[PDB]
Design a protein around this ligand. Structure first.
Ligand SMILES: *[B]([O])([O])[C]([C][C]([C])[C])[N]C(=O)C1=[C]N([C]2[C][C][C][C][C]2)N=N1
Ligand SMILES: *[B]([O])([O])[C]([C][C]([C])[C])[N]C(=O)C1=[C]N([C]2[C][C][C][C][C]2)N=N1
Ligand SMILES: *[B]([O])([O])[C]([C][C]([C])[C])[N]C(=O)C1=[C]N([C]2[C][C][C][C][C]2)N=N1
Lengths: 214, 212, 199, 201, 219, 196, 204, 199, 196
């Protein structure tokens, strides 16, 4: 996939005490045109893993299909073993790298969130096969706009509560709406804890336009 | 579309009489942004071998996994652990198999040889390699190598005793060159990870670097 | 960028979005694209910010001098001609469409499109990257004999529809109504814009 | 890179410099540019370090297999033909290797030049690398077939030294070898800076 | 480079980092990026370093002539008109990206001026390769009519975000506080980074360096 | 550029070629043989891209020799020339073509002396005399001016000398020595080198 | 690149009441060395020197045009130019060729004519100044020079220690550079004397 | 080319223009872009005529076989998936967007956009070169709970607005209404198309 | 490619150059002089792009001669070398640059013998010996090996012969004859041509 058609913008992710939260807007962009304003870019993988994706939407749908089948296949066995967030992150990394090596990349940047054995997981996988883990993540334009704010809060308070992480994410979504031209004021927030994966949406950020009068 | 990305990072290795040091910074980058400040570039292969990699992180992750599998395969068919020099010889052939679509990785191996002396091997991306006394690789490699030539190799000095390098001196020197490299190289920073390989095993040490 | 101007009996209504963009980054989210060339003459800017700003200033200067020499308020057609002249002469170098709208005692409310050096008088004009998405909308909604209130409502709706679809448009909606009585400015903020099918 | 070899009355001399570079950066001054295939066979390297190192090591493997199969030890002419056929399969793919194969077989001292295009030439003297034109000038001016061993060693050392003085891509130390009927001997390993200062005085 | 400015209740605060790089190597660890245009008008420069330097010097010179002839304090709008008319003339080739701030008779004014000659008057702006990071801090925490100390803290946090997030920025934060009363140039207002202490060291004795020739010339 | 030349007489074929092996600006070898003996009465003169000439010539040589081993008699010059062209033309549109120029000289028991000219695109032409390389531009007219079909071998050698002398005076390249061979009913004979 | 066509490296170091300037002596066209005594450091006053690295032709042209300008300045003003004033003069000269630049990056080192305060700076090809308190480098091996300077430079060094420091910095830096070297010349500028030394260096 | 499909309670309305173009020349002014894949499933074609025709035939074949094997009428989602699969697999080679609309007993009237291999279910979809000009129009005119008559009127208006503005669209308007009862075809000729602001 | 060479002794300067004028593959002239006499003690050796060499050299020659007419004395080799560089560098960034390589040899009353090397980009360098062209790659090391600062003119001529002999054996181009001149306190002297 050298020419991505419909693409999604930034995906945010931050760890908190006992879970991971990820956010993404519901926009499917066709160049600069906001073509699909109601598409979910966040997918539940299993009970402990969630996936957010930016970039080519068709590639994300294909990855969602393949990943979804894998999980179903594993569940059929009923042997007591299931894919952990780390294992899915590793699988995705190999998948992306393989595609990139044949000069036919899956044009996506992904954020993997998960909670297993009392440990929160947050992984990043780009289209070139570049992968790593961090306390907070932001793809695309979020790397320049959201990440700085996220990191700043984590430099003063490394361990956040669920409520703090949620509020911090909403603040980032507002900034993205103000400064990213391919963004849309309609997003989803997915949370993974010990109780499983939950997806809230659609949500909107409160916007201030006081400066226009100035 | 480009299949590569420059992710920065610097790796250093120094061989002593009965030790080898492999050190690296922990910043992972892309463009002008930082992906993470906690990505060490040195992996343990065996109890007396460490590899330091730098370059395109996509190839760095894949090559390390491939080497790790080849060490297990070698052990199963030869009934022993691969030595530092056999790992160096084998890595050369793995890098040369992608001679037309290369791994963009600069490797440096640090460990002990069969006589328990420090050994360092440096590689270019397509497999060419040689044994050296010390070596810098990656983003700040041209800043560090001249200083190691003067302070460890004693080049350009007259009336100087060529004493053997001790672990203590080698450790301070490693910390100093990385502190100097973090000031000038934009890709080098955050933290320094130092692995010391001796006959007693591999010990690790972490030291902070400038965050800007 | 989305700009629009409508003629009504006795004056004009001109409006635009407030987004300045550099690729995918919003460099200015509250920019005023409506610029006065004279007391009752305005121009809407679209295209390159530097070119449009330079052209608008050059024209304002030429019209000011012209007005003091002729001892009377400049006609809207004269302002359009001055803009057309500059736009045509430097067509190879300039990438900006300066839409002209205003009121004078001879012809009343007039709207002129002067893109690329070509001058055309229209009952209503739309420009900028976002105008492509509202062509169908304005062709079906426009009715002759609209009042200023209706014109203001018509303009607000069209701009709002374009801002939602066009990535290069957004922010707030600037609105100016020009008549014999004077210029009336108005700003419709993000939370007060017309709402249509969004999901 | 500068490598040279010549036959004379007492065998073959082989000498090289030891510099490797990447652009303008000198990546090493201690590269070994002579491969010892067996005790009567040597290979020199010039061009891309990974291509030279890999294909000459592959020749060494083939030479060893030949000896186990035939019980006889490959000749210099057949070793060079094996190398030239190996790299000829990748012609046009940007391999970069200029090698000299030198040894002593049943037909006496042999010297061949082989390169990445498939060129294979037998000769009395050769020079390869970016500093090879400078080496040719000094080597051809002082070369005589009746040179004594010490005189041949001196000519080899002077030709490499003057090439490293003029060519930016050559330098470091000179590794010299002497190919004889009973096999090769490593003559010396001298730093070219000590040599040039002693010639300058 | 990260440069930023905001309009507060009584004036303008300008901010910058102090790192100057040649490609990917740090050349200067203490480059002054906030330049004097006039007593109550300053400028922060990003983009091509020799263009910024020459452009601001030419402007300061022309603005000084202007104020000698008129006998009055220069207006911020004049600086913006001189700068933008010069930049448009060169069609973007003079790569000067500037933030112009000052206080005149009409109050505090902040402008951003871009290489092709376009400009915008705004209550807060950021420029340079660390601009998105600084802008995120402003969008998240700016309020109109802040007090001098609140604005100083906000601008410092915005520059600091660029310093820690952008590899083209680093070093210290410099600030310029401009009000009706005074100008406070705070070169080195915050020093968030510093070279490590260094464990061991190196020492060269007397004649460690071999010398070939020597001439002494007395003055 | 390399130089090849063939002159066909009533009952013999005379061929000559330069002995320079070059690498960029330096002559690496000054006594390189560009002639390949395919059989007792057939010579193959080949020049062109480095590597290709030897690989191609050797391939032909091995096949010509194999024909003799399998049948008990040698392939004629005409059959050999066509076999060479066939092979060269087959690789023309392939991935690995052979950029070589050649001359095939031979003596057939029934047909007599033959000279064949072949370019890199595999066009085959029989000719009384021919030349390859940049030098052919300065010597072909000389052959046109002095060559007769009944020229004797002594006059042919003098005619060849005339051509080679022209190269010494007019050509920009340094070609001081040439290999000279003659093919007739008694086989391939080595003549003295023509040096300057 | 045009800046590596001839090679070369120049560096200036500040000491305690003194300055040092050094350069390589190699003049070469690409890989071929032509001479080993090419001048890169020109005197611009009693205690003021300028080092030029980059395209050899522009090195000579810039030095000559600067000499022309400085001479006229000294006659008209009747005084010796200040180190900082020379930097501005050089920047102005290089900026005039904004679109069609001289391929050279000058390095200035000297002591003020009345207070003898050490001064060093470096400019780029366009004419942007970089006044520092420690050292400045320029040339094909700048990365290597930065490395050597960053770890070896110390504040308040006396003339002897400063000489050793800059000498070691240049020697080890040019040894890792293929097109730089063939000797090193060093100038130690003190308030009362100028010392010029040629170092024993590799000639390969 | 302009195509549009709307979902209504009990079925779908799909329509398109009839213009086939080769640069500035009209190669076919009365082409039918509405193609049946099965008894109650249709697809609208946009983009390359050859690619769309080939894809539609491949799908019709696959769905026919599938229907006879499962002994029941194929679901609309299955038809969309089959089209999506072909469209995604050959994304590098195919330049055609096959919009799917139909009726089945499980989910009723469904509209699927399958451009580039991405499958999305929508209440209404628009495609082709001419669809860009009617985005604003459909966002302001669309209302939930529309009847089939209203859906037919809504579709006709939007297509007419696009045909007037888009050079690549024109001719007549093809319309098909699909429900449980069956397929109803309809052709609105040039002289019977809705008229809006034209001068 | 043309060949130039200069060797500076204690009280004289020895220069030599090939005499070949070429057009593509043919030597149009075999006795072409590449040396231009600027003054009684100054020689200008020039090679390079066709047309440029003569146009440039003549321009310098006319200006050097004009200086002598206006002042009564000749410009020194150093001043002449710098005048040449200045002019060459001025046309470097212009529309009509001069693609020429040169050597300036001269003898100054007070300063003695001088040899100057100048490339096409106008970088000027004084040197004990120098060479221009492809041949310089094969002869510079020979000069490095045998040259001493106190070399006599008889030994210098033998040293030049060594260099020229190397060209005959190693260089691919045909350069059979060279112009040899010497400049000292008694002016410019023509030595015998060195031919092969
Ligand atoms: B609109 O999008 O057309 C808008 C209208 C202008 C303000 C008249 N134009 C721009 O968005 C715009 C942005 N820019 C530059 C981009 C690079 C940085 C400086 C501004 N130019 N026009
Ligand atoms: B020599 O200069 O030819 C030398 C000989 C080798 C060591 C046997 N070669 C090299 O120096 C050399 C350079 N490179 C690559 C060139 C392109 C950039 C990466 C290095 N490989 N060998
Ligand atoms: B429409 O403009 O998108 C239309 C839709 C098609 C019929 C599905 N496409 C075309 O107009 C069109 C024309 N062509 C070819 C042009 C060259 C001659 C053969 C037809 N392909 N698509």
């Amino acid at each position: 996939t050298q020419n991505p058609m419909v693409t999604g913008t930034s995906v945010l992710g931050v760890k908190f005490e006992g879970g991971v939260v990820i956010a993404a807007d519901m926009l499917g962009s066709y160049g600069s045109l906001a073509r699909f304003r109601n598409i979910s870019r966040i997918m539940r993988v299993n009970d402990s893993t969630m996936l957010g994706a930016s970039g080519d939407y068709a590639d994300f749908q294909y990855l969602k299909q393949v990943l979804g089948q894998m999980v179903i296949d594993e569940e059929l066995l009923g042997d007591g073993h299931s894919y952990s967030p780390r294992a899915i992150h590793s699988w995705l990394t190999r998948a992306m790298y393989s595609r990139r090596s044949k000069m036919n990349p899956l044009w996506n940047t992904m954020v993997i969130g998960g909670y297993a054995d009392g440990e929160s997981f947050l992984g990043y996988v780009d289209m070139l096969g570049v992968a790593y883990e961090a306390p907070s993540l932001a793809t695309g334009y979020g790397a320049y706009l959201a990440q700085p704010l996220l990191r700043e809060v984590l430099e003063k308070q490394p361990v956040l509560s669920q409520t703090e992480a949620r509020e911090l994410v909403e603040r980032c979504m507002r900034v993205l709406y103000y400064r990213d031209a391919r963004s849309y004021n309609r997003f989803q927030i997915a949370t993974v804890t010990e109780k499983g994966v939950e997806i809230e949406g659609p949500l909107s950020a409160e916007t201030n336009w006081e400066i226009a009068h100035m | 579309f480009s299949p590569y990305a420059f992710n920065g990072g610097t790796v250093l290795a120094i061989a002593g009489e009965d030790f080898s040091i492999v050190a690296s910074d922990t910043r992972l980058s892309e463009g002008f942004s930082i992906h993470t400040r906690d990505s060490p570039k040195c992996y343990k292969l065996t109890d007396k071998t460490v590899i330091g990699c730098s370059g395109f992180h996509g190839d760095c992750l894949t090559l390390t996994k491939i080497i790790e599998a080849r060490l297990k395969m070698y052990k199963h068919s030869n009934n022993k652990t691969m030595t530092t020099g056999a790992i160096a010889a084998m890595l050369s052939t793995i890098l040369y198999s992608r001679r037309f679509f290369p791994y963009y990785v600069y490797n440096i191996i640090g460990g002990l040889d069969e006589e328990g002396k420090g050994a360092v091997y440096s590689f270019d991306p397509v497999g060419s390699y040689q044994r050296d006394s010390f070596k810098a690789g990656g983003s700040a490699s041209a800043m560090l190598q001249p200083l190691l030539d003067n302070q460890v190799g004693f080049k350009n000095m007259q009336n100087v005793e060529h004493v053997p390098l001790s672990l203590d001196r080698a450790m301070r020197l490693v910390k100093d060159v990385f502190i100097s490299a973090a000031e000038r190289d934009v890709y080098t920073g955050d933290a320094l990870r130092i692995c010391i390989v001796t006959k007693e095993g591999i010990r690790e040490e972490t030291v902070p670097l400038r965050k800007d | 960028t989305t700009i629009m101007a409508v003629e009504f009996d006795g004056g004009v209504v001109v409006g635009s979005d407030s987004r300045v963009s550099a690729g995918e980054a919003v460099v200015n989210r509250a920019f005023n694209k409506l610029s006065p060339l004279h007391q009752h003459i305005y121009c809407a800017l679209s295209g390159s910010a530097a070119d449009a700003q330079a052209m608008a200033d050059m024209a304002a200067y030429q019209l000011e001098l012209h007005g003091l020499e002729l001892e009377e308020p400049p006609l809207v057609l004269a302002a359009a001609n001055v803009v057309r002249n500059i736009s045509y002469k430097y067509r190879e170098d300039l990438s900006a469409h300066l839409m002209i709208a205003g009121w004078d005692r001879r012809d009343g409310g007039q709207v002129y499109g002067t893109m690329g050096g070509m001058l055309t008088r229209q009952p209503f004009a739309i420009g900028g990257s976002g105008s492509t998405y509202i062509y169908g909308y304005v062709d079906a909604a426009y009715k002759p004999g609209m009042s200023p209130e209706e014109c203001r409502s018509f303009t607000t709706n069209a701009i709002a529809l374009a801002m939602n679809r066009d990535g290069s448009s957004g922010g707030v909606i600037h609105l100016v109504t020009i008549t014999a009585a004077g210029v009336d400015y108005q700003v419709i903020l993000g939370n007060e814009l017309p709402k249509f099918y969004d999901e | 890179t500068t490598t040279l070899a010549f036959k004379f009355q007492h065998g073959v001399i082989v000498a090289v410099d030891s510099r490797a570079t990447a652009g303008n950066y000198i990546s090493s001054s201690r590269v070994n540019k002579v491969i010892e295939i067996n005790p009567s066979l040597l290979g020199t390297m010039s061009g891309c370090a990974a291509d030279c190192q890999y294909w000459e090591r592959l020749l060494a493997k083939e030479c060893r297999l030949y000896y186990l199969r035939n019980g006889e030890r490959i000749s210099v002419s057949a070793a060079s033909k094996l190398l030239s056929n190996m790299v000829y399969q990748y012609r046009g793919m940007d391999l970069s290797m200029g090698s000299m194969i030198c040894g002593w077989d049943k037909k006496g001292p042999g010297l061949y030049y082989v390169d990445q295009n498939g060129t294979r030439l037998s000769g009395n003297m050769f020079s390869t690398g970016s500093g090879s034109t400078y080496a040719y000038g000094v080597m051809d001016s002082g070369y005589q077939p009746s040179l004594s061993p010490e005189e041949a060693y001196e000519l080899g050392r002077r030709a490499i030294t003057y090439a490293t003085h003029r060519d930016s891509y050559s330098g470091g130390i000179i590794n010299m070898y002497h190919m004889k009927e009973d096999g090769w001997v490593k003559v010396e390993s001298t730093d070219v800076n000590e040599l040039l200062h002693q010639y300058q005085e | 480079t990260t440069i930023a400015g905001l309009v507060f209740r009584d004036g303008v605060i300008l901010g910058a980092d102090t790192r100057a790089t040649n490609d990917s190597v740090v050349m200067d660890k203490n480059c002054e990026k906030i330049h004097f245009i006039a007593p109550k008008i300053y400028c922060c420069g990003a983009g091509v370093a020799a263009d910024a330097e020459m452009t601001t010097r030419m402007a300061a010179s022309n603005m000084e002539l202007h104020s000698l002839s008129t006998g009055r304090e220069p207006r911020v709008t004049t600086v913006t008109r001189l700068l933008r008319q010069t930049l448009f003339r060169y069609r973007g080739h003079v790569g000067a990206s500037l933030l112009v701030g000052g206080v005149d008779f009409s109050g505090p004014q902040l402008y951003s001026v871009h290489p092709h000659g376009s400009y915008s008057r705004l209550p807060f702006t950021a420029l340079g390769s660390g601009q998105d990071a600084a802008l995120a801090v402003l969008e998240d925490r700016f309020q109109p009519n802040m007090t001098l100390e609140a604005a100083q803290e906000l601008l410092v946090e915005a520059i600091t975000a660029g310093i820690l997030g952008d590899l083209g920025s680093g070093g210290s934060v410099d600030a310029c506080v401009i009000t009706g009363t005074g100008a406070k140039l705070l070169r080195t207002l915050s020093s968030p980074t510093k070279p490590t202490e260094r464990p061991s060291q190196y020492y060269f004795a007397p004649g460690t360096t071999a010398v070939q020739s020597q001439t002494v010339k007395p003055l | 550029m390399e130089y090849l030349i063939g002159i066909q007489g009533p009952d013999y074929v005379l061929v000559a070629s330069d002995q320079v092996a070059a690498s960029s600006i330096v002559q690496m070898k000054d006594d390189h043989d560009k002639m390949f003996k395919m059989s007792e009465k057939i010579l193959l003169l080949c020049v062109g891209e480095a590597g290709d000439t030897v690989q191609f010539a050797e391939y032909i040589q091995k096949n010509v020799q194999l024909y003799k081993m399998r049948n008990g008699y040698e392939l004629s010059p005409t059959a050999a020339a066509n076999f060479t062209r066939r092979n060269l033309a087959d690789c023309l549109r392939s991935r690995t073509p052979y950029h070589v120029n050649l001359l095939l000289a031979g003596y057939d028991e029934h047909e007599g002396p033959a000279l064949y000219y072949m370019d890199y695109l595999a066009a085959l032409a029989k000719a009384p005399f021919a030349a390859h390389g940049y030098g052919a531009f300065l010597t072909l007219s000389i052959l046109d001016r002095y060559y007769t079909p009944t020229i004797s071998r002594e006059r042919a050698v003098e005619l060849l000398r005339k051509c080679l002398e022209e190269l010494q005076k007019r050509f920009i390249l340094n070609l001081p020595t040439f290999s000279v061979r003659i093919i007739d009913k008694n086989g391939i004979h080595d003549l003295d080198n023509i040096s300057f | 690149s045009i800046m590596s066509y001839n090679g070369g490296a120049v560096m200036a170091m500040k000491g305690k009441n003194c300055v040092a300037i050094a350069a390589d002596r190699r003049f070469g066209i690409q890989a071929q060395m032509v001479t080993t005594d090419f001048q890169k450091i020109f005197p611009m006053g009693d205690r003021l020197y300028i080092g030029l690295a980059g395209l050899a032709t522009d090195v000579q042209t810039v030095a000559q045009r600067l000499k022309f300008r400085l001479n006229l300045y000294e006659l008209k003003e009747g005084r010796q130019i200040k180190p900082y004033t020379l930097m501005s003069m050089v920047a102005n000269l290089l900026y005039e060729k904004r679109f069609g630049p001289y391929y050279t990056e000058p390095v200035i080192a000297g002591l003020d004519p009345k207070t003898f305060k050490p001064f060093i700076c470096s400019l780029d090809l366009i004419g942007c100044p970089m006044v520092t308190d420690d050292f400045v480098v320029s040339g094909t091996c700048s990365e290597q020079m930065y490395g050597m300077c960053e770890s070896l430079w110390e504040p308040n060094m006396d003339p002897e220690h400063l000489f050793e420091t800059i000498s070691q910095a240049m020697l080890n830096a040019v040894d890792r550079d293929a097109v730089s070297g063939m000797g090193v010349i060093v100038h130690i500028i003190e308030k009362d004397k100028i010392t010029t030394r040629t170092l024993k260096a590799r000639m390969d």
